[PDB]
């Protein structure tokens, strides 16, 4: 409506194709493989949105935490509605074990994200762990992520970066996330029917 593409999916509190949009990604960082998705992103004659993992699934981590000046909603810091930025709990970030089997006979649109920081003392602030990662897999694809850390500019007022990724989780299949830190999990997902 007022938004771009991606952020509108991620949910981007600033919006509820578009040529060159005001709001794409409210927090900085890359977007991995925008182009590819765009193509078969259209050719969809049917659409609705539903949840998969609520924030209430995690007792071992601090759920509603990340919201920033870079992503406010009416002057109040917020975050991409559907993505969820996870912070350490009780000075502790237990490695995440979570999996979602798609029981729906209809396919599923899946995305998640990785937060890049600058100082590792600052890494120690949020995630408590000096060296973290993300590793996900579905059937064909197996992903492994690590945050790149030195220092940076101020883009969107922010010194940090956030890369997000995408996949398509086949029906009666699963997807396996693994991270001890620097990870941004999903909350709500998209049921998709192709053309």
């Amino acid at each position: 409506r007022d938004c771009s593409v991606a952020g509108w999916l991620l949910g981007n509190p600033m919006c509820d194709e578009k040529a060159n949009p005001a709001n794409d990604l409210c927090y900085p960082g890359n977007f991995n493989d925008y182009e590819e998705l765009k193509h078969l992103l259209s050719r969809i004659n049917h659409f609705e949105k539903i949840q998969i993992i609520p924030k209430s699934s995690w007792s071992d981590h601090e759920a509603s935490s990340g919201v920033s000046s870079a992503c406010p909603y009416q002057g109040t810091p917020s975050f991409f509605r559907n993505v969820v930025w996870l912070i350490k709990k009780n000075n502790t970030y237990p490695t995440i074990k979570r999996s979602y089997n798609n029981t729906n006979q209809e396919d599923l649109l899946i995305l998640w994200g990785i937060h890049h920081s600058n100082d590792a003392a600052e890494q120690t602030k949020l995630y408590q762990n000096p060296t973290t990662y993300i590793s996900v897999g579905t059937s064909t694809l197996n992903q492994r992520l690590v945050p790149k850390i030195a220092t940076r500019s101020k883009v969107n007022g922010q010194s940090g970066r956030m890369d997000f990724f995408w996949t398509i989780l086949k029906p009666n299949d699963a997807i396996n996330f693994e991270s001890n830190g620097n990870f941004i999990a999903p909350e709500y997902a998209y049921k998709i029917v192709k053309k």
Partner: antibody, heavy 123, light 106 residues
Framework: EVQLLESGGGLVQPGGSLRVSCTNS????????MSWVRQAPGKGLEWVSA????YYADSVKGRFTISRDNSKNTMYLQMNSLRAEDTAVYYC????????????????????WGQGTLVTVSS | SVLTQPPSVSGAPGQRVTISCTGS?????????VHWYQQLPGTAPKLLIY???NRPSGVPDRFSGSKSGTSASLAITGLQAEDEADYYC?????????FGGGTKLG
Amino acid sequence: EVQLLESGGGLVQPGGSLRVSCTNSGFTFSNYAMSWVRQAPGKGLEWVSAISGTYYADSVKGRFTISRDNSKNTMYLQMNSLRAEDTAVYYCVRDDSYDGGGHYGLHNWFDSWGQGTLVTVSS
Amino acid sequence: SVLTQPPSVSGAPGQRVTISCTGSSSNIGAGYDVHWYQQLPGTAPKLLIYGNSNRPSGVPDRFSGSKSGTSASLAITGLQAEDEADYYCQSYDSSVVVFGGGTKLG
């Protein structure tokens, strides 16, 4: 050390005026939001105001003014109209946020606290 | 500036004491975090807890915040004579900032 320093406070009369600077070293002023928190005698803490963009608590509104100079790396609080109940020790404070390079007060905390400078309203 | 806190606790060394900070559904029924401050008697406040469960450095592991609904709790295990102070909780409501009323302490 990381030093927050508030200077120049003392006796002011009711309906007086006071300008209190907070003096800063050890980090990059412009990279953080700052606040003032005051504590009355035998009382707890009450948010006064903050600046990255200026915010103020209700009790002070219109008679307090928060101002920051990163050129000189200090920040003021202008208090006019001062009554009685305004007497408190004044802590200059650091706003520290999960979300980092934010200049934002919305939800962040106070990690670094000033030494405090007591303002007194009476004769 | 007031959330709610008990006036004072009392405890014994090594024992465990629990500090409640209550509130309405407006502020802690919102999801904004709770932060705590340990302020030595005649000294500035020191940031104690932040983000409800986390501590900065120079702070012991004997300190744990737990946030529940419209309330929140500060607990201390393995007590020491160095731990005596006024404990306030901070949170936001419709901006501003709100504080506890503090809690004091064989």
